Amino acid sequence: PVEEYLVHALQGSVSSGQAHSLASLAKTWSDNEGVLLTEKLKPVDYEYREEVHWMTHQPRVGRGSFGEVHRMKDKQTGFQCAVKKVRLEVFRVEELVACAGLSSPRIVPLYGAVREGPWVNIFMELLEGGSLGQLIKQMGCLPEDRALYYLGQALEGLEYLHTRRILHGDVKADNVLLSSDGSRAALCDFGHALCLQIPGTETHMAPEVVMGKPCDAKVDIWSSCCMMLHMLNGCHPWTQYFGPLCLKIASEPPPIREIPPSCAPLTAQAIQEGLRKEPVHRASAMELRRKVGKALQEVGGLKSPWKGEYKEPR
Template sequence: MENLIGKTIDNYKIVSVLGKGGMGIVYKAYDTKLDRYVAIKMLTPQMTDKIRFIDRFKREAKNHAKLSHPNIVTVYGFIEYSDFLGIVMEYVEGESLDKVLQRQGRIHLYDLIYIVRQVLYGLGYAHKKGFVHRDIKPSNIMLNKEGITKIMDFGISKSLFDKDLTKTGSKVGTVFYMSPEQVKGLDVTHLSDVYSLGCTLYEMAAGNPPFNFETEYEIMEAQIKKKPTRIGDLISNTPDVLDKIILKMMDKNPNSRYLDCEDVQSDLAELEKNVSKLQTSYFQKRVNSSPRIKLYSILMFSGMLLFLLALSWFVYNQVDGLLKSNQLEKFKKYSVESLFAEESDSLFNKKIHRLNSGVNNDFNSIVFADSKTSFAVGDSGSVVVSRDTGKTWQSVNVNSKVLLNDVFSFRSGKCFVVGDSATLIMSKDYLASYIDVPTMQMRDGITFFNIYFKNENLGFITGNNGIILKTMNGGMNWKQVITNSDNLLYDIVFTDDKSGFAVGWEGTILKTTDSGETWIKMDSNSDTYLKSIDFNMNGYGIIVGGNGTLLRTTDYGRNWKKQNINIQGGFQKVKFINENYVIALGIRGAILISNDSGENWKQLKTKVYSNLNSLAISPSGDIFIAGINGTIIKLL
């Protein structure tokens, strides 16, 4: 195959080789028009020697391009060059799951849950759109540096092959993850993807595929006839629910598997609860102590005990002498209480109190409508409401199973919910009743991520493909404004009636100075995703995003400076509590707090291992945080 490095095809300059496979070579390329890196899978000439294949390839690429989800690698289109045909895709800076498995052997249960949950999000979204992947396996799952999991090769690699193109041995490398119906050559449905993900999940937990035999025939026979060895029989102290999930995903009868990806999520939440209760170390081996070591331990303990008794006698005599003298008066002004009085009442000493939300689905947003009423929304149409200042929560039926990303509420009871499939729900009575609001003719694959109102009339919605919608009549009618961007936009905020900012994918920062009618792109000096933005009244602002990115401004957003934050993974949300205090939420339970408008930060020890996605402040000043697996916590 011709070496394409250094060549320019259309507006793509080929930079390097990312990988090679049976279908061709994957290149890293620079998009000179849109100023970004992309990945291009160039198919070998042998793969493109049939007109029918080329037509089908183009059709599949167009269909795949309709999928727009954070957990699916985006396809931008295809290119033709000489005898080559290429798919232009999103470039993911990271590594595939199979490389992680090769390096680590197996995945820790906390990370396993975190990765599989994101794969389920992406698969579930695609299945609802009518797509079946057909080739879920570790090498088709990418883990980027921001902690986001992405599915590659959706709907292309398997569906492109005509029967006359499939040769004996072409299944090698993927047969480890094939469903029984695939092995038999039967038609496959989304349930085949569930089976393949079950095989992948097994390998993540055990370190090997479920049927790790030498010949392809043995593996195929096992996929049809055998049950995998239970993880609990291989690794001690493994929660039983893990085997329950895997065995159900890998049931030979498709109709006995989980019905869909959402069905898997509920049991995955149960697994996470079990893991959090484990007192054992999942990856550490116990070493039996010899009699000599035990003797040394006893002698050391005895010596330490004698030392402590002597020290106690010494301290007692010194303190007794101090109390009988007048020297104690000199130390009163340096008491512990006075030294830490300023911080004792601060957010740094907050404790975590878990609340029962009544659901296991992930929450993406939480908000207070008034002093008593609050809402949280999330995955699979989940909506819960509290009418007693967050003490108890009840589910609200909105007749929707789509992913809900954000909720906004006025004190009057008027509230809005946005989400996947251009969903926009409006209520005037705290969601006791609601209507679906039309948002123009939104094309397929549009997702709304955030809804924000500057006042009772002026509001905005952000979405993928650079979409910003604006309303000037309190949300009754919406229009799309000019953003000059096609990147996903996560969050939006205004500093005054005219000036506002929106942040999103690939370091995007957009700014408006005309009340959101037009937007211009600012230089963020970042190529990772930016997830959330907030300002205080004095012009101090914070942006947080992937890979621990935290940007700060002190001049109403005219200049942004990157802060050095020592945190693994990405941030999900940032919010000013008042003019000085600001909270940032991250993955795996990270809560960072600053008391100087974001210049310096401290991390709370939460013992929470779930991703935290949103926070809200009640009118009385109580702080509530929502996250995955139905997590709602209150800072006490």
Template structure:
């Protein structure tokens, strides 16, 4: 069956990339396996679907964020090689990581061993600390955006900037729009706060850590809106109740990062990484324990766009 979008991509950039099979698609992008002709390397080619690419705000933000992300050179960040608009197609080419997503891994084997969870979380925190130091906030940290290299097992983070591309356009016409994945969204992001910083990524990574160690999310809800309300106003069950063998200091490091107020979390992702690897580091740095936040009952935030469908590959949309 003919794929009109693929045909359009081939017509626009077929002289630069040999476009292969589709790896996955969702609300924000479509990804193809491709081969860069000149450099003879295999890449993941991510393109905006026409319904988004025709909006100048989304397209321009997509390209700006992709170009910014291309400046990130870190062992735990998926490299972005190039981004451009050609023939009406907004696209970016990035390294194709052979392996699976952390989401796929958890679906396949369940919760992780404590040492493995600690290592993976520290690797992602390291990537986030580096990105934040360069002025880039991910805004959509979740297991499907964490890739696990098949050979080395190392974690690499992908999809910087895609959520922000849609967020900027929607904010032009809608107040209080929440962009991201509801199950991993920080309270301030759920409330549509325009001023989120690296601590929102820290919260999302703590949700991933909670899930990695316990085998379940901090909150369960029947809808995206209900999930966001719980992130804003409810406190999750202590990790110790769900998995008593998790070291208390590790559980406390994650639970602090899940504080409702950004100021009550770890100061930055670099600090979070240090306490994940050595939870005693928090005390050594003189960082006092955060008080447990009191539950609140805020007005319901608006529902975010529906999540993208599950991909059959490790590429995140």
């Protein structure tokens, strides 16, 4: 009714506004329009067009699975951030709706979203430490205490999301970004998200996902523990032993055989409680974050350097 009227006032234009206005407009995304949420990205005469009001980094390099994430500059403000390009035809409303208006240290801030032609350009804080995925490739694999430290932070983000009945849907190293000193980790990429009451990465898929069963917040927990194994071992679960990986996840025992023997007992225990095949038996974000918290205390806290020495994968 009035929502109809607000939406009309937003269509056809790029404006500065609040998270709720971006959500409402987003819903119409199944021509240059959208909403910018920070003072640092500013429309000019109803517009925000690539290579006119904003420009991506000089020689076009990119991050993400599809090389779709870029460093960018507002031409007027000079402010630097990041953009994820999503194809309009494939844009999921939920990537913005389950995202806009959140505010947590453990979740990457949304800066706005603008439609231009066949593109939905989603803007966000540029996290300069890169992704946890890049770190793992750089370092070979992570020390136990660093792995726990980041797993806890990811879990705090999941706590925050789960309380709001948002499923992340693709929890993994590649989707955990780091500040420039490595001390702050945050969840990004809500391209797979779903609001509770296009699938994630196959290796990190929970059995109930793979089997087509009913899914809740607990899927994120399983994914996060697969990510933990990725951190410790320097490779995804199921890689070493296995054919289509989605068949083995359903039938086979959880990949707890991949917990390194070197890990401390409570680290091992925690990964096991997050890798229970049945969701009822699997730990919640709150439960697991607490365990992982003491797990990190049990190995003397965070001590190892963020970029220490290389360590060979398994």
